[PDB]
């Protein structure tokens, strides 16, 4: 069975024939994994947009304000 | 507030994504409901939803021209401007009852909850005793910040519990200590 | 056995005629063609490719007391309302073996001298059709009639997303900004379109 | 009222939609409010349920009652099960002028309960000779009225106004001066009896329900094995008395598919139904025992013509989602299972616990609609029976009258389209030894079933 | 026209058939069309969000309907016929048959006709 | 029970038919639409948004002696006068359940060989409609028919003011100078329009 | 369209509902529309000079009329229907019912339908 949350939803969006399809289930498990990562990545970009939650993007903010990035 | 220009890429149509995805296939059928369509269409649809919603919202919160909420606050902190905070309604409540009765700080008295309106909770800021005169006045405060509260003169008439000997609880004058969160657009 | 069902959809009403269509049903069919004469040869028949609208008509009486039933006055008001309905009606006739979208062309009621409660009905239908006004390639035909209706106000469910609501309830799915840009939807929805809650009432356009 | 034009407005939910419903259901409800220890009939009205038993979702009354109400049952026979220790909220109000503070009025809740009814009396600002009596439920105002100082009027005025369905005043003693001002005095001493309901206490409701008649009975959202076995025997007993009661049950929350199916297999009576799945409804979980209330209501509401073979339930999500193989096992075991399909929770196949045997003709007995169809005919014949047992002369003309009555009654079922063919005739065998109320007759009918499955074969 | 082939999928096993090489078993245009037809019949309409309104059928929803037997037969004919005919390759579907083998449990047949099944006139000037 | 009422208003007459409409009433309804053919597709039905005028017709006899009654000759003169009335008539038919403004299209009487006192009537009605020829914003629709009539001469009451008379009796209320500028109104009214007396007879325009 | 909200007014008490703050209790557009409908029904037409001819009803004047019972029923339907429908938000009013509970004392029902109650077609190219 698909492990990815997004994979399960995307598989359910198709016709119901794929209950036993290991191939299709494995396929959308892989697709769901990437979309899960992108959603996490997308949330990560939101943190970079501010100096308070910049995290690894804080160097950009330090670069923006001229502070010695380190 | 200002409208947000959006890059053309972030506003791509779902079918345009799917059409590009199916461009390379030329041997196998790509009809709707076909297996190749099944493999590709959910990806194209998911991309469009994420691209149109997730990314555009991220662009919106970037600048103070279009940011909001906590996001707009932090951009206020970039240039050291803070939005105003709310306050609790403050006022005085008159109590009448047996002189031996004692009223403690932290006691809760509210307004009359009804079907139309819910009761506004207020807390006493002082501990007093009725021992000298049957009437006493206790400073009180709304338990919730904001202009909620700031009630009329005789609004406060409800005690959640039941204190022995108390004959009547009535606010004497309208409360005035309340003020709401500053408007986002005003803060913007 | 014979029955007649009118399944209105813009008004979700599944009307079943209390009374069978009196004397006899009948449907014509006439090929769409034109006649042309040619000098020294005479007449000829040229078929025209398009089809032809054809009518179904009959007459009934709506009895006062009979198996499901309703007042004849309300039924007449129901049908007379449906006459002006732009959207099509689904007509099914069991014994006659007819099934297809139609629209009421003409309708008439009548109160006879006796039997004042009943209403003699004479109704006529027209076969209904629809007008469906890059990278050319063969694809599925657009033959399916799109006769389906939904409430003008939507209650958001737990798993829903604004894109998903647009596709399920407004077709292409990229139509979501039409839902969002309505000020009532903007008020109830947060300033982030991507965030939504179970409950919030949302108003699809049109 | 004066002659003239008057008008009001109401929400469409307030429409008198009770018309056209069917079926009768019973419940031994736990309730915070209302009459105790008696059966009460409700005509499928939410407000009527609200007034009669409050609206506390924590208590099984409003919660399960709402679900059964949503099941479109014509009449719901509710019994306020109680633990004992019953008490009514009560309070005593005292006079001012007497320095001993004479107690003159006792107030009491209309029904036993434990909810926070409170009283606030303040000096009437317009006139000290009167005082404003405001009745509270917790912080919420519930009723207000000014009153004269004399005690008899005060008790009368409290008992007079419309909004005192909750509390009834009573005079303890007479006095001249008005009651003492007080604020939010709770009517202490009450008790709803919901605490620590005994297993035995359910049996009181059962015997009370027996004098009444109802199409089905469902437990109060409880999966206790002893109650189920007790109710199993109780319903079986009532069948021998001619009362054909259909029982709905639901296994315990922690029971897996294995436990549920074994429970259904363990008792395979056609009068018993096991729900093998919890369900969701605005984020509130409902155990299989709780869901059986809604299942019972839908089955009862469908009556004869309808069935729940693929009915779309009100529920929003079912926690145990089963594969087709798991569904097949549960369905084979007599377990009734709700399945999730495209955002819709749908009951499947209308089964009951009777699936072990299905000995040819008894295959139909495994479905709820078939049993409901059978029981109703027995009830109708039983009604016609009691009009003539020892009350019509047992002659050929009289017997022909009875057959004419029964035959016409079945002919009504033909008019409904329920039955394709039927026959009712003299039972010549048992007629050899007839007596005054021992005339005997036989019949058989062909029930029309609801379409359940389709097989298509695409030739190409 | 130039319809294209597709990949087999054993509906009995609910899995793709693959060669000993491990590649999925390709198959003919006509085989693909038959594969598509069964899939479209089994796909309920308006519910599986990947596909548009054209794709899918509504046979499952008809089960709960209160229409009579004869009315349900016509609806089955309309629904199956409408779902299949969207494909370009379809020429005609019909010759429907029904058999209510039990009181309320049905078996039905229908015959599909391809574009290639057409008969061509033989003449030239 | 069935009755027919014609409530003329420009002549404040509430006529009630002494006799029910003979054999049978009937009203048609026909959707306003047009047919268009398209090359290689065939016919299609396009609904036209506007509604359609529909007719009600029947026949009666005005008996000489019968429950309220009047001479048939006068009744015919009454109706024939109403035929030329530009203003609309209100027609109410109890059992048929019809109620709406109509205007008489055609009317005819007849004296049979016998029964010389009675007059056989055949009458036809047409559904009536009205033609209602800054700071744009939504407001109440002008759907109410304005069928109300007042005497052409007004007797001023005690509390009345000239502005109030204009609004009650001429609509907008700012129309008062139209009342005043009539020389008869100027003569009876004082030279101050703001001053008026109970009694003074005043003539609204038109 | 952009209809706007209005302020509550308890017709039972004949007073505006005001919060503990003392400000009058605002309410929704739909609540305001329902408030408006009851007011318009209770306002006789042509008599209250503040409003034009569009506003108000004439139900009170019908009491003195000599029309039969059935005629009065239709007039009630016409009058109520005409008065309500002037509002833009109205879609349709109907399903009128009557009950002459006594010899000459009447109770009647009617059902109102909002613009939002309409059903929308789901399709796009």
UniProtKB/TrEMBL annotation, chain A:
Protein name (database record): XkdT-related protein
Organism expressing this protein natively: Clostridium phage phiMMP02
Part of the intact protein present: 1 to 70 of 209
TrEMBL record, chain B:
Domain of life per record: Viruses
Residue ranges annotated for the Baseplate protein J-like barrel domain, each copy included: 93-178
Signal peptide feature range: none
Similarity comment text for this entry: Belongs to the Mu gp47/PBSX XkdT family.
Name of this protein: Baseplate J family protein
Species per Swiss-Prot/TrEMBL record: Clostridium phage phiMMP02
UniProtKB/TrEMBL annotation, chains C, F:
PROSITE patterns: LYSM
CDD domains in alphabetical order: LysM
SUPFAM superfamilies: LysM domain (SSF54106)
InterPro entries: Bact_Kbp, LysM, LysM_dom_sf
Domain LysM: 152-203
Name listed for the protein in its UniProt record: LysM domain/BON superfamily protein
TrEMBL record, chains E, G:
Protein name as it appears in the record: XkdS-related protein
Organism per entry: Clostridium phage phiMMP02
Lineage, highest ranks first: Viruses, Duplodnaviria, Heunggongvirae, Uroviricota, Caudoviricetes
Whole-protein coverage range: 24 to 148 of 152
